[PDB]
Amino acid sequence: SSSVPSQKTYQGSYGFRLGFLHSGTAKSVTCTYSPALNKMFCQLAKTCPVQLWVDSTPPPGTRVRAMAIYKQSQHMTEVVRRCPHHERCSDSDGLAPPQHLIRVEGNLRVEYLDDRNTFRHSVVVPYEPPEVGSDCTTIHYNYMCNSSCMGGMNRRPILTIITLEDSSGNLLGRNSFEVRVCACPGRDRRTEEENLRK
Amino acid sequence: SVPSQKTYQGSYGFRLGFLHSGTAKSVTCTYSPALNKMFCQLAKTCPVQLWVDSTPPPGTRVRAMAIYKQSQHMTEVVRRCPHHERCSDSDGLAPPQHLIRVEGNLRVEYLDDRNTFRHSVVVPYEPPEVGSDCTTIHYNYMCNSSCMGGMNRRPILTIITLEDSSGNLLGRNSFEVRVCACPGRDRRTEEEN
Amino acid sequence: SSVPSQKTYQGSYGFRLGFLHSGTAKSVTCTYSPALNKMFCQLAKTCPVQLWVDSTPPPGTRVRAMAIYKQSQHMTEVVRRCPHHERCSDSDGLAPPQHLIRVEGNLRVEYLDDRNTFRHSVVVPYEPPEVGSDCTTIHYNYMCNSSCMGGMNRRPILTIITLEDSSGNLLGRNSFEVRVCACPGRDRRTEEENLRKK
Amino acid sequence: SVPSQKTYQGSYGFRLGFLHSGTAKSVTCTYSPALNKMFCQLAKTCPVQLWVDSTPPPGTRVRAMAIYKQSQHMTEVVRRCPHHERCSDSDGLAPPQHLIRVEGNLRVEYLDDRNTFRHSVVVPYEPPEVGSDCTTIHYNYMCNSSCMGGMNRRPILTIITLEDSSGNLLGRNSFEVRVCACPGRDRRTEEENLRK
DNA sequence: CGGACATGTC
């Protein structure tokens, strides 16, 4: 079993926070975020845009790390990883190791860490300021198993934790959101939002 | 020595409530109001509800502790039997020797009392969620009452105490527990009698 | 071709199969449909298959079972357990974890991966009926659902049962479709309901 | 890896004998010839007879060892359950983890094997008394077959071997054991199921 | 085992 990372929102000295697109709940949607639940619903291997918003600009060398943990405390000390089938299915993007649930796409400077000591997986990219005319920096994440994958997540909900860190891995900022990876994100978002009514 | 089992509703009008789940031979947890007794299966979810007339201050804590019901056994610490103490069933948070765990709460804290040696488990008190009239804690009991070398078919009470952040008494309630393979079946053998 | 033959034939001992008549209660553990020649059964539950002969074959006769895919486009693919169930802790101490079909309650059981085809099979000595019985019952178990991703993945299989002499020469064969599923009764009823026109 | 359980009467014609016993509900110890199985209560005397055609040499010893009968459990060392191992019920000679004890014999030795981790108990072989045909050892079994964390409802075999003073095998036999609260009841049940 | 429903595919 592994110690548990903090999931506490920390805006830090750069005013670090997250943003998400507004996508709707049509059954045709590949990734959609629920503000009410602070929860992303997405399809396996489809683009999940996460926006990085800051008040001041973090210094060059700053990195952005994403890590999954189980949301339920009775599972939180268990490492999150891909199921046996998907680990073997060779849908490699050329850089992500097969065991990793979360990938980043479109970024040559991506790095994957399979930690020596907690054994937890994470994916990290250098922080980049927003492009010209933009208020935020967007990272494209992929989740490589469904929440239901037997022998992996096994229908257990996860949280993704996003940390802004310095070149030595010291904490600068943190935010998190729950994720469900599922076949029909629009439908499932609607169901969980309806259950919130309750 | 023996921890108090005396009902004390206190200034917050603290009371316990239980799900009314009926008596199927193997329902996972059921409660008998006639006996004030919870019948539950080993390691399964055992909801216990905290009902208050007014909200205790934040920092308030909710502790649970098992004692033997019968006078001749009351001074003996309630613990898991030698077999279950050694099984591979740690949730990563709870001591393997503790009978009572709480599931679903990352702020769970476990105590072996340095003086009495008794085991207990504590969580922060939180008020009920919107739409709810009570706070539910999910307890697990990790041995059957019948376990040889543990409870050995001796009945226990669970004592639930409401405490301030320093451990001062704010409220107390309790209930008898039978942990068994067939809670529905057994509830009756005490409720058909 | 190289696909093993599935062609039913009784041969000189008048070899054929019988099944229990278990009905269609929703979650019955194993049931057989004569209209479909199809067994419906739950993962890892006892599946009684009866061997009936008109005359007793010789000492050293053996009885082999093998799965193949029923659809022509999948027939050349070896039927194996999915990676999840392969790696799960459900061993009986005898079966290879990769094998779909086990025999329970028989210490003389032997498992084969084919030299040339790599197809899996399970074989036991033929024994004549017990005193007072007219058939020999073998207890099979199927160790993945038809639905298992990374395994059968929703493709139908047939089970081929062969009676063989001690050198492996064929003496008789019978095949039947198998659906391994959570609700054998439900699914049998549904499939037979779907035979008729409105 | 399992010690052999193969019956080996050897050059001394080594056999075992058991009282012709009854099937009263809680008789302390009872052998089933039909099952080659002893049914006995925890900690009660279990007499076992040694029968030989030719007497073994001086320094011969008699060893008893339990193994699980069922093939998928055979690799596992038979030991007492965590509760009984900690019960303090030693007779002064048997280490507490050992399932099988010998009563009434101060020359008993208990072995914890450093290579195999199997437990066994061994006594010197003594020829039958005058006008006696056989030698009786009194064994005790210190967990029920049911004990969770120990045998856990798994049937066991007891293997009795004759060995020379250096531990070389002279003969071997075996029998099934159920340790249980009601040996006669269970004998009957198991013998009824024999018909099925 | 199996009503209710979770969750995937056509």
Added chain:
DNA sequence: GGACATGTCCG
């Protein structure tokens, strides 16, 4: 959005 295929939970 849709109907269904086909699984798990907990009594």
Added chain:
DNA sequence: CGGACATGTCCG
């Protein structure tokens, strides 16, 4: 002693 009962387990 056997019967009743307490109480865990499993097939189908």
Added chain:
DNA sequence: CGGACATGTCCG
């Protein structure tokens, strides 16, 4: 599940 049972404990 639904009983049938497995298996220890208590009483007559």
